[PDB]
Amino acid sequence: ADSRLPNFRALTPAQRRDFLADACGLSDAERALLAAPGALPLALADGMIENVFGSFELPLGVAGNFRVNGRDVLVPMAVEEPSVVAAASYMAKLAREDGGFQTSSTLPLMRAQVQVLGVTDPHGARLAVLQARAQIIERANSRDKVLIGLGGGCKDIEVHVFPDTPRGPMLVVHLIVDVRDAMGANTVNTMAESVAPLVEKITGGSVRLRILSNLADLRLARARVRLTPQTLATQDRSGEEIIEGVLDAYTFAAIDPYRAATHNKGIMNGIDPVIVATGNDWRAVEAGAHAYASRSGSYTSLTRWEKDAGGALVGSIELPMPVGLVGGATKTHPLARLALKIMDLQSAQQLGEIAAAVGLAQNLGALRALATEG
Amino acid sequence: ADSRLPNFRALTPAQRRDFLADACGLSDAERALLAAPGALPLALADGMIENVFGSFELPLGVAGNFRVNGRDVLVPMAVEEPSVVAAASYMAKLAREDGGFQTSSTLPLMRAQVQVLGVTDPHGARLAVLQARAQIIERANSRDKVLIGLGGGCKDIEVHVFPDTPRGPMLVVHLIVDVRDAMGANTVNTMAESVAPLVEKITGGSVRLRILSNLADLRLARARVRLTPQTLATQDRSGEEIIEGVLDAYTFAAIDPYRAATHNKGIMNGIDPVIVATGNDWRAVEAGAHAYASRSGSYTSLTRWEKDAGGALVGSIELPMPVGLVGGATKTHPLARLALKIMDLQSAQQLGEIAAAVGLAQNLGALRALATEG
Numbered sequence: 143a144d145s146r147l148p149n150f151r152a153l154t155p156a157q158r159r160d161f162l163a164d165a166c167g168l169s170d171a172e173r174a175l176l177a178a179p180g181a182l183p184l185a186l187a188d189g190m191i192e193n194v195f196g197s198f199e200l201p202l203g204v205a206g207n208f209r210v211n212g213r214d215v216l217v218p219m220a221v222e223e224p225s226v227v228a229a230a231s232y233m234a235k236l237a238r239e240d241g242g243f244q245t246s247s248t249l250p251l252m253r254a255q256v257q258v259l260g261v262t263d264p265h266g267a268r269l270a271v272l273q274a275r276a277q278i279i280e281r282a283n284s285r286d287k288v289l290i291g292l293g294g295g296c297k298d299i300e301v302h303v304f305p306d307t308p309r310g311p312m313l314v315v316h317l318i319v320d321v322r323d324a325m326g327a328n329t330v331n332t333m334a335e336s337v338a339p340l341v342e343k344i345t346g347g348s349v350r351l352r353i354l355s356n357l358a359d360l361r362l363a364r365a366r367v368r369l370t371p372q373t374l375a376t377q378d379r380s381g382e383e384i385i386e387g388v389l390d391a392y393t394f395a396a397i398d399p400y401r402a403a404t405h406n407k408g409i410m411n412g413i414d415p416v417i418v419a420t421g422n423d424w425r426a427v428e429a430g431a432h433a434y435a436s437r438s439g440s441y442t443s444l445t446r447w448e449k450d451a452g453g454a455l456v457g458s459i460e461l462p463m464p465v466g467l468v469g470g471a472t473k474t475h476p477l478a479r480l481a482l483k484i485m486d487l488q489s490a491q492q493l494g495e496i497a498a499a500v501g502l503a504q505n506l507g508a509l510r511a512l513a514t515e516g
Numbered sequence: 517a518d519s520r521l522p523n524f525r526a527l528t529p530a531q532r533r534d535f536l537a538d539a540c541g542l543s544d545a546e547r548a549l550l551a552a553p554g555a556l557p558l559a560l561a562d563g564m565i566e567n568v569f570g571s572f573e574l575p576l577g578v579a580g581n582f583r584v585n586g587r588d589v590l591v592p593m594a595v596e597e598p599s600v601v602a603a604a605s606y607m608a609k610l611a612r613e614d615g616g617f618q619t620s621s622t623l624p625l626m627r628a629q630v631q632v633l634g635v636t637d638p639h640g641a642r643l644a645v646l647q648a649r650a651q652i653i654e655r656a657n658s659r660d661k662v663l664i665g666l667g668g669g670c671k672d673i674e675v676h677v678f679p680d681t682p683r684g685p686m687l688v689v690h691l692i693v694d695v696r697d698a699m700g701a702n703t704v705n706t707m708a709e710s711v712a713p714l715v716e717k718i719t720g721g722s723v724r725l726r727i728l729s730n731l732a733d734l735r736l737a738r739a740r741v742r743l744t745p746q747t748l749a750t751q752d753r754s755g756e757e758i759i760e761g762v763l764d765a766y767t768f769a770a771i772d773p774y775r776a777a778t779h780n781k782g783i784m785n786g787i788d789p790v791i792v793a794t795g796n797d798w799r800a801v802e803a804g805a806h807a808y809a810s811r812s813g814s815y816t817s818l819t820r821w822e823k824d825a826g827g828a829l830v831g832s833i834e835l836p837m838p839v840g841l842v843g844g845a846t847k848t849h850p851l852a853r854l855a856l857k858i859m860d861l862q863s864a865q866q867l868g869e870i871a872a873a874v875g876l877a878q879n880l881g882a883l884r885a886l887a888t889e890g
């Protein structure tokens with residue numbers, strides 16, 4: 143795998159398509175799918191959403207130079223905004239000097255909420271539910287033998303109590319579910335329905351909402367990058383001066399929600415187009431990201447930018463990354479399947495790690511540009 | 517204008533396209549633009565983003581029944597997820613019984629941040645900047661005579677001081693700019709550059725970031741809906757019982773960020789597809805919405821659901837809505853221009869009000885469905 147895109151600025155879209163097809167070993171059918179419009183015929187689109195009367199195209203670009211955990215990866219991006227793809231590619235190029243991005247993730251754990259009303263002893267009922275955790279987990283896992291055979295399934299539960307609300311006390315059971323390579327919404331929603339009668343029997347209450355949480359803070363992707371001063375040096379500015387400017391811009395985002403919103407928007411300029419191009423749900427990724435950014439009690443930066451003891455710039459990101467390689471549009475849309483092949487994805491976790499790296503690079507591109515503007 | 521879509525579930529995409537073309541008075545060229553793929557040829561896409569090698573289609577559906585401030589409006593939605601378009605259409609149909617949605621907006625005011633470093637008396641320098649507000653406003657307005665002739669331009673300034681940061685004191689000037697029918701990013705970024713030398717002269721400091729804020733809390737859209745119990749009644753449930761279930765679900769989102777993230781995600785299922793279909797920047801709308809949802813110090817619901825004194829369900833939303841009718845992809849993409857024509861838009865404010873109404877309806881659809889699931 144080689145993610146370098148020599149002279150791509152000067153090539154036509156057809157020439158870029160042919161280069162990508164050669165670099166990724168795309169089949170003749172896959173090349174033809176890209177060479178004509180309408181890779182998603184209306185008959186297919188008609189089965190995806192309601193009241194279909196057409197299709198709507200986003201430009202599809204490729205960000206170059208990315209290397210993640212030692213592996214080059216080409217990154218498709220479906221987006222309408224200028225400068226985004228070029229900035230991601232340029233920051234990835236600089237990241238290559240330190241060996242690229244380094245990433246990790248948690249297990250692919252999604253939360254399903256089971257909201258219980260009518261329980262007047264919710265703290266005591268919480269203990270009864272926790273004592274019965276094995277029975278609840280077994281009930282959650284009793285229908286999806288395929289997921290369990292892959293090593294997924296419900297792994298744990300939590301119980302949260304809201305003893306005083308305008309609607310009375312609420313007891314909320316969270317099922318913690320390993321969803322493997324799925325985004326997980328339908329999987330965990332079905333388990334929440336499955337456990338509802340047992341939860342009602344234990345608590346004596348009435349189950350209302352049975353629904354995933356998009357605050358997917360048990361399904362985190364992490365990415366780190368390090369750039370020395372010499373890597374960041376330009377004709378006009380020392381790398382040291384650029385590093386100090388990035389830190390100035392980062393601290394501004396850390397302390398001021400008015401800046402943090404724009405700073406994090408820039409991250410999502412990198413992440414969302416990868417989500418879209420792979421057929422994933424961009425609203426879910428946006429909600430998890432921005433809700434996680436508020437976890438401390440103030441809306442703040444999702445990234446951290448620092449200087450290590452030797453003076454190099456170090457960037458880091460950690461954020462929920464609920465994405466899948468199966469199900470939804472990722473299965474039905476022929477170009478989403480092609481995007482997965484271009485990226486050579488082995489797991490949904492890997493897709494999330496790559497997306498986090500792209501968001502981190504995008505953020506660096508914005509901070510480096512804004513801090514070096516004369 | 518009539519936004520009812522009779523028997524749309526049973527029509528083919530071609531039949532739906534022809535109905536919409538007839539209802540909206542679309543030209544023959546516009547009808548043909550929808551009837552074949554590739555409304556955005558690669559030569560056009562190639563000028564929008566970098567490294568273009570293709571295009572990526574989202575299904576394009578239409579939500580029916582919406583009526584906003586007494587005017588029916590058909591709502592294009594570019595999205596990949598099932599159930600979304602049908603739920604928006606169904607909730608809009610119920611809203612028609614009370615006359616539809618009622619909306620308002622603030623002036624289209626965007627913030628540009630001018631970050632000043634090196635000022636050791638930032639509180640005193642803030643006063644010097646405020647005393648010079650007229651001169652700063654005149655400088656901001658000196659280049660864009662067209663915007664000013666439309667009644668736009670910089671209208672006010674604020675100054676915020678962060679006296680103790682890891683990077684030293686920061687003084688941040690906000691330019692408050694009426695951007696008329698533009699999203700406003702380039703407009704306000706240019707004004708921030710224009711005022712930087714004058715701000716440096718007044719404060720003695722050094723300007724670093726000159727950049728819009730995506731926390732666009734001076735550019736708000738508001739939407740309200742009211743539904744009586746008889747409107748919400750179904751074969752299986754009284755409207756009264758459904759209303760109580762919606763309130764139960766709403767309070768859950770108000771008090772628990774794990775639920776609020778999913779609740780607000782549902783809002784963005786309605787809003788974002790309209791943003792995409794009109795060529796607008798969906799990352800900007802997402803960032804403003806979710807950052808605003810954290811303004812109270814906890815991540816919470818963007819909507820409010822209540823019962824009025826007579827027992828009717830009342831929903832309300834207020835959120836930043838930075839959208840445009842001009843500039844960006846909204847000008848270049850032929851289908852984005854067609855979307856504006858389908859919606860018969862008179863201003864960017866109106867687009868924002870319609871989008872807020874769609875988000876409110878989408879939220880109602882999710883809460884009503886989740887609360888009435890057996």
Ligand SMILES: OC[C@H]1O[C@@](CO)(O[C@H]2O[C@H](CO)[C@@H](O)[C@H](O)[C@H]2O)[C@@H](O)[C@@H]1O
Pocket residue numbers: 240241244367368
């Ligand atoms: O992993 C090697 C070893 O080197 C350290 C520095 O002591 O990290 C360096 O190597 C990493 C692997 O490429 C880089 O990601 C990092 O930027 C670089 O400093 C240790 O952290 C690590 O144990």
Ligand SMILES: OC[C@H]1O[C@@](CO)(O[C@H]2O[C@H](CO)[C@@H](O)[C@H](O)[C@H]2O)[C@@H](O)[C@@H]1O
Pocket residue numbers: 211245246247489491492495
């Ligand atoms: O696959 C999950 C499991 O594999 C490990 C082994 O190192 O990580 C592999 O897959 C991850 C997802 O891309 C990468 O972060 C990692 O580099 C790769 O070796 C474990 O980290 C993880 O538990």
Ligand SMILES: OC[C@H]1O[C@@](CO)(O[C@H]2O[C@H](CO)[C@@H](O)[C@H](O)[C@H]2O)[C@@H](O)[C@@H]1O
Pocket residue numbers: 614615618741742
């Ligand atoms: O605007 C009319 C007048 O009626 C009130 C109720 O007293 O609101 C009703 O009419 C509105 C306009 O259609 C509806 O939006 C609202 O739902 C309905 O109650 C007053 O608020 C208003 O002044």
Ligand SMILES: OC[C@H]1O[C@@](CO)(O[C@H]2O[C@H](CO)[C@@H](O)[C@H](O)[C@H]2O)[C@@H](O)[C@@H]1O
Pocket residue numbers: 585619620621863865866869
């Ligand atoms: O156009 C802004 C200006 O017009 C008013 C007049 O009522 O509102 C008009 O346009 C708004 C945007 O769609 C609508 O909310 C309103 O219904 C419509 O009459 C003022 O509200 C506003 O200051």
Ligand SMILES: C[C@@](O)(CCO)CC(=O)[O-]
Pocket residue numbers: 223404405406407408409411508509512727
């Ligand atoms: C450049 C930026 O505004 C994104 C442009 O869409 C992000 C940022 O300011 O960090």
Ligand SMILES: C[C@@](O)(CCO)CC(=O)[O-]
Pocket residue numbers: 353597778779780781782783785882883886
């Ligand atoms: C139904 C919902 O999960 C959106 C589905 O994408 C939103 C919600 O739970 O309110």
